[PDB]
């Protein structure tokens, strides 16, 4: 899940074969969404306790954003820690390409190129539209192709991700036998 | 009225079936 | 359409100017401020001439409000001298 993973790019234009374009934006908040959504955000158990030494280690940067002016009395996390998977390294930071910063609903008249080149592996480029939409790669969340009569209809759900010693000390005594 | 209330209910049911089978 | 509307409305005289200062206007404003400060150095408060004597002291002109300020070598705010709009510099 990287901001540059769609190998092939397909560009459409609003003036042609487009029937409806709805662009929406929302402000991030932990009140709504699922626990996984706030886990992907700054919320996470930064402080964990190793079961061997008890040193109470920290695994990630805190992130106390829009939580308050104190920043020294609270932690802004969850109760359940993430399951650590690696041997020594910590769990990787949220990719961020799974985070939506804009949402786009595109209903448009289906064409052949709009059928073969419109897959979630491609990067969408919408032209002849609002300046903040033009020139940006839109990640296709889903494509739907409906057929009710001779007409073919296409619904595209897309989005934009906000994303960028000499030796050991002591050993047991050995016996060495020249052979 | 009741005819359409039922139609709307059935629409909602089928729309939900869409979603049930839309998500992995 | 917006320019004539902003011209009709009387300027705030305490916040944003109607015309944002351009780069050449900023150069001319720094010229006027330097001229005034070099002319009025003896009447400047002890604090102001203390920072003015510093070779690492900077003036800071607000591009949108026209406010001119003095900062010492440490980068902390020291004092304010006046306001520069498009044509004249008004000391405070």
């Amino acid at each position: 899940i990287t901001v540059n993973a769609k190998k092939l790019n397909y560009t459409i234009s609003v003036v042609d074969n487009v029937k409806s374009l709805i662009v929406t934006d929302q402000a991030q908040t932990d009140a709504t969404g699922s626990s996984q959504k706030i886990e992907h955000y700054g919320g996470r158990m930064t402080t964990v306790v190793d079961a061997d030494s008890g040193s109470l280690i920290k695994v990630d940067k805190d992130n106390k954003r829009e939580a308050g002016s104190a920043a020294r009395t609270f932690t802004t996390g969850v109760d359940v820690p993430q399951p650590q998977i690696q041997k020594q390294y910590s769990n990787p930071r949220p990719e961020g390409a799974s985070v939506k910063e804009f949402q786009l609903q595109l209903e448009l008249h289906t064409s052949q190129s709009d059928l073969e080149n419109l897959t979630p592996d491609t990067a969408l480029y919408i032209e002849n539209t609002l300046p903040f939409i033009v020139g940006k790669s839109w990640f296709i969340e889903s494509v739907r192709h409906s057929f009710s009569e001779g007409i073919f209809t296409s619904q595209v759900s897309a989005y934009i991700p906000v994303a960028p010693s000499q030796g050991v000390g002591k050993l047991p005594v050995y016996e060495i036998l020249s052979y | 009225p009741q005819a359409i209330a039922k139609q709307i209910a059935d629409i909602i049911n089928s729309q939900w079936q869409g979603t049930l089978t839309d998500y992995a | 359409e917006e320019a004539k509307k902003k011209v009709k409305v009387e300027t705030v005289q305490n916040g944003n100017l109607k015309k944002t200062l351009s780069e050449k206007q900023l150069i001319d404003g720094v010229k006027r401020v330097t001229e005034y400060l070099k002319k009025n150095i003896s009447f400047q408060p002890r604090t102001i001439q203390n920072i003015l004597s510093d070779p690492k002291s900077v003036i800071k002109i607000d591009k949108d409000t026209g406010q001119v300020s003095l900062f010492n070598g440490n980068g902390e705010f020291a004092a304010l001298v006046g306001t520069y709009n498009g044509d004249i510099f008004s000391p405070s």
Binding site: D25, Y41, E66, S69, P94, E95, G96, V162, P164 | - | -
Partner: protein, 154 residues
């Protein structure tokens, strides 16, 4: 023990209180009429026999007690005699500041007047503000109060 002090010239401690007199123009009886309206919204009328500020307010503005608006437009004493054929400036109703009282209908006191709604409890400019000195610059240009995103996600 008593310390001795001799005349100096310019100290920092005197410049802490060198400020004493302030020539400001804040709300007062002499600063009520700060804003004057140009000729883009005034009608120049002549003073005829049988004319009065009451009739001018009734005719042009439609309100009998609006005559003060005419008087402030000319800076004249209504109790002093106006010569016949003298030019008065009557404000037009179409281009005027509405004199509609502003209230907050849901307040801890129930209802209260506000003049600007910016020096009231509705300002919301300092709410949730992370100082930073970078949010301040964005407050100055556009007045952005809250952010929209807070995630690290790199």
């Amino acid at each position: 023990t008593t310390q001795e002090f001799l005349s100096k010239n310019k100290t920092i401690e005197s410049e802490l209180l060198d400020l004493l007199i302030k020539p400001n123009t804040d709300d007062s009886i002499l600063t009520r009429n700060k804003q004057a309206i140009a000729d883009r919204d005034l009608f120049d009328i002549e003073w005829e026999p049988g004319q009065s500020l009451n009739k001018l307010a009734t005719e042009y503005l439609g309100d009998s007690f609006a005559w003060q608006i005419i008087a402030d437009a000319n800076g004249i004493d209504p109790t002093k005699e106006i010569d016949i054929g003298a030019g008065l400036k009557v404000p037009d109703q179409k281009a005027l500041e509405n004199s509609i009282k502003k209230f907050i209908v849901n307040s801890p006191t129930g209802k209260q007047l506000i003049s600007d709604a910016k020096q009231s409890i509705l300002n919301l400019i300092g709410v949730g503000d992370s100082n930073t000195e970078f949010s301040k610059t964005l407050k100055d240009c556009i007045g952005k109060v809250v952010n929209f995103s807070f995630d690290n996600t790199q």
